[PDB]
Amino acid sequence: MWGKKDAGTELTNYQTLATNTIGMMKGVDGYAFTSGAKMTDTLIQAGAAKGMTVSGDPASGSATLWNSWGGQIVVAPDTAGGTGFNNGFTITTNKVPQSACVSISTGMSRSGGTSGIKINGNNHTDAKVTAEIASSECTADNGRTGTNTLVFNYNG
């Protein structure tokens, strides 16, 4: 059971991939290249993050997940400046409407602790998003506000 919030579903999902991919199918073999595409394909196809089909990047740089209920997702690794086997994974997600811009922020506010939060045309990392912030940052109410592009980064 989860309930409580209908937006927390994604918050727990993203953290699900982070804890699953932590040691599920992030290259449990040791091959050439980074393969930041088949990495998620194998994790998702493993039923970890999501048990659906993935689109292996035709340009080889960042895989993309097709969200039916949501919108679009872009899974890309971001491993730069490590010390104790710390990997930084960056998953952009574009679907969270204004109603969720608040619920998602309320849930992201419980563990603010920045790492690589990049809001729509707001490429940042120390971006501190909260309930009271999402109450102001998002306009009063514009029904279906412009696409709320939010990148989640997970270190370790």
Q: Give me the domains of the chain, ranges plus CATH numbers.
A: 7-156 (3.30.1690.10)
CB 150, CB 118: distance < 8 Å: yes
User: With left for phi above 0 and alpha for psi between -120 and 50, is residue 47 left, alpha or beta?
Assistant: left
User: How many whole angstroms separate alpha carbon 49 and alpha carbon 152?
Assistant: 14
Q: Which of 106, 97, 94, 110 lies closest to 138 in space, CA to CA?
A: 97
Residue type, 68: S
**How many residues comprise the chain?**
156
- Residue-wise over 42-57: b if at least 16 C-beta within 10 A, else e? bbbbeebbbeeebeeb
User: With left for phi above 0 and alpha for psi between -120 and 50, is residue 25 left, alpha or beta?
Assistant: alpha
User: Is the C-alpha dihedral spanning 131, 86, 16, 67 positive or negative?
Assistant: positive
Please report, for the chain, how many H helices and E strands are present, in that order: 4, 6
User: How many whole angstroms separate alpha carbon 66 and alpha carbon 51?
Assistant: 11
Q: Which of 137, 145, 136 lies closest to 98 in space, CA to CA?
A: 145
Helix (H, G, I), strand (E, B) or coil at 17: helix
Please state whether beta strands 118-119 and 54-55 pair in parallel, antiparallel, or not at all (unpaired): unpaired
- CA 19, distance to chain mean position in Å, is 12
